[PDB]
Design a protein around this ligand. Structure first.
Ligand SMILES: NC(=O)C1=CN([C@@H]2O[C@H](COP(=O)(O)OP(=O)(O)OC[C@H]3O[C@@H](n4cnc5c(N)ncnc54)[C@H](OP(=O)(O)O)[C@@H]3O)[C@@H](O)[C@H]2O)C=CC1
Ligand SMILES: O=C(O)C1=C[C@@H](O)[C@@H](O)[C@H](O)C1
Length: 259
């Protein structure tokens, strides 16, 4: 049997539960796979090059997490599937000696979600995949962000874009910023309170602890959900891509969910 190398690129990366759930799958499916796969956390400098590192490390496949998903989109040799509409790549696979990118956040988020409009906080890789997905489900989408960079993408999708918080009600209030993992609110506390009091679901992408955003939803008795189901769904989808589409995602998902 041959060894194959995988990982997850990020900064920070120490929080990531992607190694745990993937490694479990690589062991569970080793015979099917006919290789011995191992998945590492990989802390990348803010100014390194995703493609060069992937190649230098000899990876067969990787995930990409904050703050690299839009950069991954720019450096792939080839993009496939819905990533072509996401402006963001979270899944890398070496295919035909080329670095190919995919996006599993869009469908992972779809699957994780059991609504007519949405407010997305955040403009980065995760927010782009989400906005693309929600617009496809027929939702109205508004995007509120700190900065005005990277908003052409949301305008062309047909979203309403803001730097000043709109005074209107949103069913879904989604925290797709990286504030939580640096552990601060994505927005002013009082503004956020008003959104929650009229909202139906507070959704934070961060997983593994109670974020300031979700603690405040909790405090107000607004229904809330963290990033765990999305993590596992996108992970499974990626694993399917890692396997060259041999292991079906639903098979990975059951192993990942239990570990
Ligand atoms: N459910 C799950 O398990 C998943 C969760 N998500 C999570 O979503 C988060 C975002 O990831 P990703 O999109 O790749 O990261 P990016 O670095 O691509 O984007 C992060 C965004 O958050 C914004 N932001 C950061 N700090 C603040 C702040 N204090 N206030 C308002 N906005 C802020 C940034 O704005 P600016 O440009 O102004 O800095 C940027 O728009 C991460 O925590 C990631 O783990 C991602 C995938 C899966
Ligand atoms: O925390 C993680 O390990 C990840 C989170 C999301 O950004 C995913 O998109 C990424 O592929 C892996």
């Amino acid at each position: 049997m041959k060894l194959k190398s995988f990982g997850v690129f990020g900064n920070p990366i120490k929080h990531s539960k992607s190694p745990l759930i993937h490694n479990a799958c690589f062991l569970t499916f080793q015979k099917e796979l006919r290789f011995l796969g191992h998945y590492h956390p990989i802390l990348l400098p803010l100014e390194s090059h995703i493609k060069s590192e992937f190649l230098h490390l000899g990876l067969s496949g990787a995930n990409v997490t904050l703050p690299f998903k839009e950069r991954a989109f720019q450096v792939c040799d080839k993009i496939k599937g819905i990533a072509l509409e996401c402006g963001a790549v979270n899944t890398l696979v070496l295919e035909n000696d080329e670095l190919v990118g995919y996006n599993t956040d869009a469908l992972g988020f779809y699957l994780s979600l059991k609504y007519q409009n949405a407010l997305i906080l955040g403009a980065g890789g995760s927010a782009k995949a989400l906005a693309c997905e929600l617009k496809k489900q027929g939702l109205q989408v508004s995007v509120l962000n700190r900065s005005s960079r990277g908003l052409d993408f949301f305008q062309r999708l047909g979203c309403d874009c803001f730097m000043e918080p709109p005074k209107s009600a949103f069913d879904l209030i989604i925290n797709a910023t990286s504030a939580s993992l640096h552990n601060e609110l994505p927005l002013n506390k009082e503004v956020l309170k008003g959104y929650f009091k009229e909202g139906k679901l507070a959704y934070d992408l961060a997983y593994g602890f109670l974020t300031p955003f979700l603690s405040l939803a909790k405090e107000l008795k607004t229904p809330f959900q963290d990033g765990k189901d999305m993590l596992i769904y996108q992970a499974a989808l990626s694993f399917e891509k890692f396997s060259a589409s041999q292991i079906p995602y639903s098979k990975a998902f059951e192993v990942m969910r239990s570990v």
